[model samples]
Target: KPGRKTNQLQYMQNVVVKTLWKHQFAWPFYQPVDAIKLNLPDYHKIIKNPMDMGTIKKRLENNYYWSASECMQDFNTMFTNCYIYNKPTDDIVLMAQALEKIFLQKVAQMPQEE
Candidate 1:
């Protein structure tokens, strides 16, 4: 029963991830942060757990998520890291906010089992 539940959740998670990948504001979050190239020496120091959309997609494909909420946590982690590292007024932060709102809206539209 648990395995069946996870499969259903995975299908829904995949749909959400695909929609996120197509968003214009999703560019910065597509891959893991490139600290060296971006000259963010303290990025890792500031954000211990770095999450990104690409990583989330791969995890979802690999069956790494047990539930929809677990997948949602990774998405939140990605947005939270952006907020913590970038200034609120920065373009990247603004993009993250926009993408986060869309993500929540999409997730909200998913059908929930009683």
Candidate 2:
């Protein structure tokens, strides 16, 4: 599962970074802030949204397309909005929101699979 592995790696990366910061007291632990964040779980959406799934699946049938600029905009929104926050920012909220949207879409499209 490439998606699961990707999510796990991200989780580990955050944990390791947090641990190193905590142990390395000499480093600017709180000057910037030592807020540890959690990696978001991947939205496999076995029952999630499908209409906005970024791409159509092979086995599952879907027809979706947006212009290139639209995709770039989405990537910008997804990445820059995604943050390794030491404090807090709404920037990191898009992925989870997108997942929720996907989950609903997946459920909506469930009949196609059957």
- Model 2 spans with C-alpha error above 4 angstroms: 1-63, 84-114
- Pick out the ten consecutive residues of candidate 2 with the lowest summed lDDT: 56-65
lDDT, candidate 2, 1-114, per-residue tens: 112223223322243223333432213222212123423344222213222212212111211222222322332333332333212545225443444344334334323211
Q: Could you give candidate 1's per-residue lDDT for residues 1-114 as a string of tens digits?
A: 232246446545567888888888898888999999899999999999999999988777676766878778889999999999998789999899889988888787876754
- Backbone clashes per model, in order? 0, 12
List candidate 1 stretches off by more than 4 Å.
Answer: 1-8
Q: What is the C-alpha local distance difference test score of candidate 1? A: 0.82
Q: Rate the local accuracy (lDDT) of all candidates.
A: 0.82, 0.29
Q: Which ten residues in a row have the lowest lDDT in candidate 1?
A: 1-10
TM-score of each model, paired residue for residue = 0.88, 0.22
